[PDB]
Amino acid sequence: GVEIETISPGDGRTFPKKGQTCVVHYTGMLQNGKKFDSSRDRNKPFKFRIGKQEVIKGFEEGAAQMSLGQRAKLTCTPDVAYGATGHPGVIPPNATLIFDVELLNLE
């Protein structure tokens, strides 16, 4: 399940498609917890493409439901990211994810 709660500004029309490589300043957050991940720290804006299952499933669908310049607010279910397994030492088992996501892409 992907829930979008948009911080508005942008265009609302340029949507990501297959074969396109997009650029995201992501920012993680644990529910009732602290940060666990940031692209704001490293200043390297995480260039990735669409459709290769590179990212987790919850972040994947929320990337397509945005447009250029927009700023969404994801909410990922446990079964789409890590929930039974848990990423070792960083994401606990049965975790619910929050993501500050800005889509400033190309192509």
The CATH code of the domain that includes 25 is 3.10.50.40
- Of 15, 36, 48, 98, the catalytic one is 36
Residue whose token pair is 């704001």: 40
Strand partners, 102: 71
> How were these coordinates obtained?
cryo-EM
- Resolution stated for this PDB structure, in Å: 4.1
Number of domains in the chain: 1
Domain-embedded: residue 61: yes
CA distance 73 to 8: 11
CA distance 102 to 88: 27
Give the single-character DSSP code of 89. T
Domain-embedded: residue 27: yes
Domain-embedded: residue 11: no
Alpha carbon of residue 62 to chain centroid: 6
CA distance 66 to 7: 11
Active-site annotation holds for 50: no
Measured CA to CA in angstroms, residue 22 lies from 32, 61, 65 at distances of 30, 13, 13
Closest CA to 103 of 29, 14, 36: 14
Active-site annotation holds for 4: no
